[PDB]
Subunit: 363 residues, 4 copies
């Protein structure tokens, strides 16, 4: 084949730098990119009703935590609106994040659309005018993007089509991102739904990440300028078998060692519906695993950094400080976790709510 | 693999029915899907302003030609605007087209975008929200769609990536279209720009189409409810070698025979810069080839059907009929060609001057 | 991509001719390429020891059937032993077959081997030193070869690995073949085992062939110099649903129309455990399907052309004439079948015999 | 996809162990797999006849080395003949190797065959009956195999086909090996021929490796029981650009980092026509490269470990020890190089190579 460099030595430089700053030792990613609909559900869980002001206030709450958070938070992924909102003192949100030492992230995909002829599988849209939006985003203080692709494990899922198609689109988004000085977080999300064991999930994970990286190679993606946001290898939510956090750290680290090349700056694990405590404990064991990890293994948590804070806040403006505290605790807990310096109480405790719902809550 | 029917027998029936109505014996397709920018170039050449009224009137001009055209036109591809425009009688253009026995088509892609790391190669965007647009377009009288993917021949083109990428986007588009009852026209266009000869073009056409069809298989596209709009195998527009139309017809038919499966209802060739007369002659000879053709071999012309009409229109009502007649002449000339009944007219007058470069100065 | 002529006009010529002559109207293929072990199993049934003499005589009994078979069979696939054997008159078997108007075939594959990591799947070996063997076979009067890959429909079969593998190995065998002036018959045999219905078989068959022809394209295969020896789309050998001959005919032709490009000279269906009469009846209805078939649709039968002959012989020389007749009559019946001119006393397809799997005993 | 364990936990364990022994810190591989034909040319340069004994004596010379190489040689690759030859003391060669601490290897490929339609490209044969060959070789002390694949760089090479095909064939060989408890060494040798620079080769290497690993994943290969035998990223032999060993080391490790998953136990580079010193120097620079190397970077040298010793022999049986010493020094030198503790420099001024191409004479 004949090379035709998509990026210049300088473009590659900026990309690597940004990536290495987000995953810097002890730092992780705050997933604050809940869409108006996602947040609407969560605000109502405490009794609060959805509204722009409430969203701004809530996001501010997380973003204006005391400086203890600074060494823990390497980046914050935001939703389109929050990016253009301002703190009570009139300082635009990206500036607050930036002054705290982090890089501003943006959710760029436009949701998942079904694939015809599949067993309910999907692909993700958002490629239209992506360049134009990536140009505005960076100009407005965005250094990285996030694009989510969902995969599901079943009797005949994920299919060859689902895997190859989803990989191919993630590769496209990534390519576009780099061209505009944007670092792309490739999120090949395999859903925990099902009763499949640890082996199945691990096996699936290996297969999908294979396709993912081969695709990136075909599309000429600069891996040093990318972050991987995969799922931790765990059993299905309906699996009757209990596994030790070590088995999870094992299955996870192994899948990665077999599919993720060293050039990848880092891996930011998603909480995937795990309780706050559990999320940190697993991330700890993953960094406590004897195997050789060529890249950072940190977090990119959403609910696993907001649960207790949301509850403690309860919409009560007076509860601002009490709510921010919970946020801070989880952040520090995970800061240690991505280093293997975390200690828990063998379970979960307060951070153990959530609850598994099977065909019960439509709303 | 495990089947999961994308379409029910009823959906397939409709699709196969529509695709058959467009490529019926002796009928072709009128491409009137120029966008505000494309049509502008054509209006300014004759001296007419690029106004909505002017575009509307010219579009009407062709869409209201005498009934002799009814048997020649199986479908008319319209641009979003023209689709929602009314004729002087207050009737919506689609109703006007379908009353005259024509099937209404719509252009749904959003243009070509660069592929990073390639040699000026591209891909096509437009998939975002396509289902909602296709579902709605169906509600407004459009029965078929059109999507264009541009490929190019060069020292290192088309590349594996460009081929794989465009082939995949086309299959995505089709899948979506068929889910909304819309018949997809795959348009894997291989540009004639260059100095390459017949052999090379043919060779590339065979690879592009093989890839295109395998992609449709992976995507479970219903081949019976599809039309393939390709380029005719011709040498480059700078090649130094005269080729008889017979050779062109041989190379073209051979290429299609090697890659386009029989189930494909019809092939609608595009002019691609050929003179009106040349488009008719090559299409005529294609149909005259001794090789077995298990699919309709007709046209889908733009400039090759409109060239003389635009010129004979002058941009004023006075030449309304004078122009319509040129269009009528060209269509029935091509109507005969897609059956092997056309007989070369010759060359003497009423030709079209596509841009003034080395002519006149003070007129 | 760029061209590098795999074959020259003269080579393409020779191949196209050889292939067309074998599938000439009314003509089919006799598949007597049973390996020493395979034939031993058949001889054991009639009470005849597996002696090279016995093998030579039986093969002779088939090849020396009077001139009535001449217009019926255009090709004879032999085993390495048979190719070098001589008939009673001292003339070599290929000369015998040749004088009778047929072209000699030879099996070249080395059997199937397991694909580790698959649900008991296989792939086929035989590529090592193939070129050398093909050059020898050619010098010895062999003008076409046979390579068989086995695939199976089941719970998680056939898988992507198997499909990709066999499709690719066939293309290797094919390419080599064309280089040595041998016409390759590509045989992607999908076993009829299992309780899978007709629709399942059609789907898998469609997908397998789509992979096959994409593979041939990648390897630059000359489709006009190739034959396809597929399985008919029939229900599983344990299906409880009863199907008519017209249904299997429609399913087989539809599948083919969706995968086999017009350029492919001919399709030589295999028996696949079908009865002698059932095979010919199915072949006939297939050629009586209203759907346009761009290529020849003949047979390449083994047991479906030998059973009665082999059975009547009983290892007794004096039964020679009776045995050969059972054969001649079988060839004659199929000769009409490939032309769609086969009708038994009743002007309808004969009813089945056992059909146990449809009875109440299969519940 | 669905998990179907190709190897039991103990099978994986055996492979991991073998592969790890071969590339333990400080150890490398001795490449003595020169076929009878190839070894002949070498013997001709030292005025020696290529006979049964002469070859055996030469192989003995290397294998019956002073125990000082015991910590240097992790494994030795033998040709089929040598595997069944015995040393003067009456011990079969594989016995000598084992006792001295090294694991016995055997190259199993049967040479390269031309790919049709390509610009003189190739693929490798050897898969036929490979399984039974492995079961026997294993029986006779073999623990690891070798299969070479050649890919040349040029105007349009390597092609997508050569990459796809060679990758698939390497994976087929790998699978068959692991099935018989043999560690397979994947060798996609990218020829250094031509005037292409450093960047072109790195690019091609990245592409080739990307395909190799995807194919291994598709075939369900156990990465922990495999070794890659790639070329170092070095410019073309006809290139006219001076590159320091530091530039070579950088380009090389980065390529592996972007493709080779950390699970790959080790990488045993090949000399690629390099001189003994140059190979030791480049390997040293490669190991002392600042970037994180998750796999063992060692050697597997033929000429670069025999050159001087071979010359010293010059047929004279007396020269035995003097020649054996030159080999010991080379082994020790490289033993230090595979750890990045080798005193050197490398300047094309004193002891230079064919620097003619860089010379003004090449203008």
């Amino acid at each position: 084949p004949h090379s035709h460099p998509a990026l210049t030595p300088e473009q590659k430089k900026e990309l690597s730098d940004i990536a290495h700053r987000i995953v810097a030792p002890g730092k992780g990613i705050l997933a604050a990119d809940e869409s108006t609909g996602s947040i609407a559900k969560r605000l109502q869980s405490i009794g609060t009703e959805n509204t722009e002001e409430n969203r701004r206030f809530y996001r501010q709450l997380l973003l204006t935590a005391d400086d203890r958070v600074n060494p823990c938070i390497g980046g914050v992924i935001l939703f389109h609106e929050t990016l253009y909102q301002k703190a009570d003192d009139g300082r635009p949100f990206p500036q607050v994040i930036k002054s705290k030492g982090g890089v501003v992230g943006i959710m760029v995909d436009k949701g998942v659309v079904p694939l015809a002829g599949t067993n309910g599988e999907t692909t993700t849209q958002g490629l239209d005018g992506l360049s134009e939006r990536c140009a505005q985003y960076k100009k407005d203080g965005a250094d990285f993007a996030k694009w989510r692709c969902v995969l599901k494990i079943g009797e005949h899922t994920p299919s060859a089509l689902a895997i190859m198609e989803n990989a191919n689109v993630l590769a496209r988004y990534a390519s576009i991102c780099q061209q505009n000085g944007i670092v792309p977080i490739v999120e090949p999300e395999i859903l925990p739904d099902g009763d499949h064991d640890l082996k199945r999930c691990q096996y699936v994970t290996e297969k999908v990440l294979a396709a993912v990286y081969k695709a990136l190679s075909d599309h000429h993606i600069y891996l040093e300028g990318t972050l991987l946001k995969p799922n931790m290898v765990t059993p299905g939510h309906a699996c009757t078998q209990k596994y030790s956090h070590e088995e999870i750290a094992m299955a996870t680290v192994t899948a990665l060692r077999r599919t993720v090349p060293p050039a990848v700056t880092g891996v930011t694990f998603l909480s995937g519906g795990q309780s706050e405590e559990e999320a940190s404990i697993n991330l700890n064991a993953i960094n406590k695993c004897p195997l050789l990890k060529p890249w950072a293994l940190t977090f990119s948590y959403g609910r696993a950094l907001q649960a207790s804070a949301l509850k403690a806040w309860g919409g009560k403006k007076e509860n601002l400080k009490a709510a921010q505290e919970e946020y801070v605790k989880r952040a520090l807990a995970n800061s240690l976790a991505c280093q293997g310096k975390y200690t828990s109480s063998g379970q979960a405790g307060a951070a153990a709510s959530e609850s598994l719902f099977i065909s019960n809550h439509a709303y």
